[PDB]
Amino acid sequence: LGQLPVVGADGLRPMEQYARPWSGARGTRVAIVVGGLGLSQTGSQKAIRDLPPEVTLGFAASGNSLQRWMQDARREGHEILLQIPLEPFGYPGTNPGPDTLLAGDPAKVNIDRLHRSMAKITNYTGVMNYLGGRFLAEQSALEPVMRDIGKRGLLFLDDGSSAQSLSGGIAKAISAPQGFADVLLDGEVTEASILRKLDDLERIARRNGQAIGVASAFDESIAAISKWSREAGGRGIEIVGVSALV
Structure with a gap:
């Protein structure tokens, strides 16, 4: 903790080391990420x-008591992801914080911002975007961001909120582990809507063999x-x- 994730001398990757074990058996599989941890206590x-511990948790880099929520989550057995603030379309009106990666900044300035977020927790398997419509x-x-993440043995989960996102193509070009969320579960934060989206998730999972849903830590979600x-x-x-x- 306080250090950046790296691939070990033996080649073991954070995405293997901190993975939650599963049955290994054939059948329909679903991952669900609930993000925003650390924002509201x-x-x-x-x-x-x-x-339940099978739900993957996304930790907000700008959050508070991150070490507390980190230890609680891992004690229960959750897999954890780090959420990295990225430049939205409404910048600087919409500002996720000072460590937000910006499209116009040079590679070294964004890599430093990334590294600051990376050091705030440990024992995560990968990173996911927070916002990032522009970025x-x-x-x-x-x-450069995906190359840094890729080389440290971390996965990249793109939340799918931008249809113009280049993360899928870049990852294929650099051989980085990446995945797109299939369903946003709580774009409308009501019980009825979330249940419908969870049905969408199940339908996509059954047909494809697997699917990923994403949500934030709202009470209804x-x-x-x-x-x-x-x-x-x-x-x-x-x-x-x-x-x-992934």
């Missing part, structure tokens, strides 16, 4: 209290996701960590 407490569409901005993930096994669905799928 009561919201983070509820997330840890209520979600993800810019090859010259995204490529936590309650709906906790209940659904606990009941998923009865319908031949194993909930696995993101690393198992």
